[PDB]
Write an enzyme that holds these catalytic residues in place. Structure first.
Site, PDB file in Angstrom:
ATOM      1  N   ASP A 151     109.982  12.383 -10.833  1.00  0.00           N
ATOM      2  CA  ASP A 151     109.597  12.565 -10.954  1.00  0.00           C
ATOM      3  C   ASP A 151     110.254  14.372  -9.476  1.00  0.00           C
ATOM      4  OD1 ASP A 151     108.283  12.524 -13.125  1.00  0.00           O
ATOM      5  OD2 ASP A 151     106.398  11.947 -12.057  1.00  0.00           O
ATOM      6  N   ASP A 152     109.714  13.330  -8.637  1.00  0.00           N
ATOM      7  CA  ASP A 152     109.753  14.428  -7.275  1.00  0.00           C
ATOM      8  C   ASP A 152     111.458  14.387  -7.052  1.00  0.00           C
ATOM      9  OD1 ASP A 152     108.304  12.446  -6.969  1.00  0.00           O
ATOM     10  OD2 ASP A 152     108.411  13.230  -4.570  1.00  0.00           O
TER      11      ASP A 152
ATOM     12  N   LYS B  30     101.459  14.380  -8.190  1.00  0.00           N
ATOM     13  CA  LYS B  30     102.594  13.629  -9.240  1.00  0.00           C
ATOM     14  C   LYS B  30     103.460  13.407  -7.584  1.00  0.00           C
ATOM     15  CE  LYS B  30     103.705  12.429 -12.383  1.00  0.00           C
ATOM     16  NZ  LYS B  30     103.563  11.479 -12.837  1.00  0.00           N
TER      17      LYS B  30
ATOM     18  N   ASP C 191     103.454  21.655   1.656  1.00  0.00           N
ATOM     19  CA  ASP C 191     104.278  20.628   1.117  1.00  0.00           C
ATOM     20  C   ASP C 191     104.224  19.042   0.696  1.00  0.00           C
ATOM     21  OD1 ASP C 191     105.880  22.786   1.866  1.00  0.00           O
ATOM     22  OD2 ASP C 191     105.798  22.191   3.956  1.00  0.00           O
TER      23      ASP C 191
ATOM     24  N   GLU D 130     112.759  15.940   6.316  1.00  0.00           N
ATOM     25  CA  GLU D 130     112.143  17.034   5.342  1.00  0.00           C
ATOM     26  C   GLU D 130     110.589  15.829   6.361  1.00  0.00           C
ATOM     27  OE1 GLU D 130     110.953  19.928   4.364  1.00  0.00           O
ATOM     28  OE2 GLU D 130     112.281  20.501   4.473  1.00  0.00           O
TER      29      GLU D 130
ATOM     30  N   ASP E   4     103.338   9.668  -4.837  1.00  0.00           N
ATOM     31  CA  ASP E   4     103.032   8.330  -5.157  1.00  0.00           C
ATOM     32  C   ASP E   4     104.451   7.760  -4.840  1.00  0.00           C
ATOM     33  OD1 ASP E   4     100.784   8.640  -6.651  1.00  0.00           O
ATOM     34  OD2 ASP E   4     101.642   9.819  -8.781  1.00  0.00           O
TER      35      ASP E   4
ATOM     36  N   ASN F  96     106.226   5.781  -6.770  1.00  0.00           N
ATOM     37  CA  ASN F  96     107.901   6.124  -7.575  1.00  0.00           C
ATOM     38  C   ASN F  96     108.029   8.030  -6.939  1.00  0.00           C
ATOM     39  OD1 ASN F  96     109.355   5.902 -10.495  1.00  0.00           O
ATOM     40  ND2 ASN F  96     108.676   7.416 -10.446  1.00  0.00           N
TER      41      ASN F  96
END
EC number: 3.2.1.17
Length: 130
Positions: free
Chosen positions: A91-92, A83, A54, A36, A86, A88
């Protein structure tokens, strides 16, 4: 900016309880990311099959999973798409867990369907220290 290597991503996802989440092995999660976004946390696909975009390492779409100022969204992960751009990826990861609970499972990610689902992934992470 951050671009993971395969084993580093595998370690990170394993630590977040992704191995076997909803029945999907760690190899499946890492392979999805490889195809991806090629492990790029700042990956961005402008025009998806929808006037949507995306975002990030898991290429989460703005019409269903997150909010963007560009257009309306189902925003199922309740978060701004930016968000996911980033370094980090916590969250993903949280959003990815929500995505697979739907009927389609990991088929929500077309690159996984085309390049991972049909592959023998038995030795995909063999070179890693898990």
């Amino acid at each position: 900016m951050k671009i993971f290597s395969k084993c580093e991503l595998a370690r990170k996802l394993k630590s977040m309880g992704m191995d076997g989440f909803h029945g999907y092995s760690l190899a499946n999660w890492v392979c999805m990311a490889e195809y991806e976004s090629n492990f790029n946390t700042q990956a961005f696909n402008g025009r998806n099959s929808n006037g949507s975009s995306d975002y990030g390492i898991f290429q989460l779409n703005s019409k269903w999973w997150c909010k963007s100022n560009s257009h309306s969204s189902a925003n199922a992960c309740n978060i701004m798409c930016s968000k996911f751009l980033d370094d980090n990826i916590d969250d993903d990861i949280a959003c990815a867990k929500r995505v697979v609970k739907d009927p389609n499972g990991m088929s929500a990610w077309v690159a996984w369907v085309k390049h991972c689902k049909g592959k023998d992934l038995s030795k995909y992470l063999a070179s890693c220290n898990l």
